[PDB]
PDB file of C-alpha atoms in Angstrom:
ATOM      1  CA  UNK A   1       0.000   0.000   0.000  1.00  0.00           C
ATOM      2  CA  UNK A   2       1.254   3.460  -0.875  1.00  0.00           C
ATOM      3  CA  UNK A   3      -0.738   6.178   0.018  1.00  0.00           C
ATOM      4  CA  UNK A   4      -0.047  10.005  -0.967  1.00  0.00           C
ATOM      5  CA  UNK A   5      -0.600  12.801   0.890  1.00  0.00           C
ATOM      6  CA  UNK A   6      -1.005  11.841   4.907  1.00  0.00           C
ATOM      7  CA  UNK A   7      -3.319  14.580   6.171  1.00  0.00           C
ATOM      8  CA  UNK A   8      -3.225  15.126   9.848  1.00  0.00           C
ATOM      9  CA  UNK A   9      -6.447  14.661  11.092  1.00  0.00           C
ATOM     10  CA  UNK A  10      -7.831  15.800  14.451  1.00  0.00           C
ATOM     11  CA  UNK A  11      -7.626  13.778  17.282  1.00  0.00           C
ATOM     12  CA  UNK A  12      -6.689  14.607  21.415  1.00  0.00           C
ATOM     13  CA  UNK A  13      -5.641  17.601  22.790  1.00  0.00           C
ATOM     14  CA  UNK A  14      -2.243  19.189  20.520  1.00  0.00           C
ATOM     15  CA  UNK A  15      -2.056  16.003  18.542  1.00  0.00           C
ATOM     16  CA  UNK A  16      -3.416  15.280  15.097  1.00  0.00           C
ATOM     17  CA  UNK A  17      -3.379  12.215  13.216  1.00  0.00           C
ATOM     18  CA  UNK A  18      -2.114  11.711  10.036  1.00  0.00           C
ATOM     19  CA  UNK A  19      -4.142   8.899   8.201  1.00  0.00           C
ATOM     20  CA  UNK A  20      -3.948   7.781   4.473  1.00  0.00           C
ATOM     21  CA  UNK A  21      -5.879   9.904   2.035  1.00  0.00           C
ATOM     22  CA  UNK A  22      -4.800   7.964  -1.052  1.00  0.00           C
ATOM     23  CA  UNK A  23      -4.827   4.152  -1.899  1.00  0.00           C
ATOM     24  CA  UNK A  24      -2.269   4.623  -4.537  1.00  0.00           C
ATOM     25  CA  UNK A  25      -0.471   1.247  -5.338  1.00  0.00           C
TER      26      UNK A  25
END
């Protein structure tokens, strides 16, 4: 799996979370 652009999501307090926001092969 290679994704593309990891785009910090929101999550706790001061801490994002940067998931996969592209399912390139």
């Amino acid at each position: 799996f290679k994704c593309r652009r990891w785009q910090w999501r929101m999550k706790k307090l001061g801490a994002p979370s940067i998931t996969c926001v592209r399912r390139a092969f």
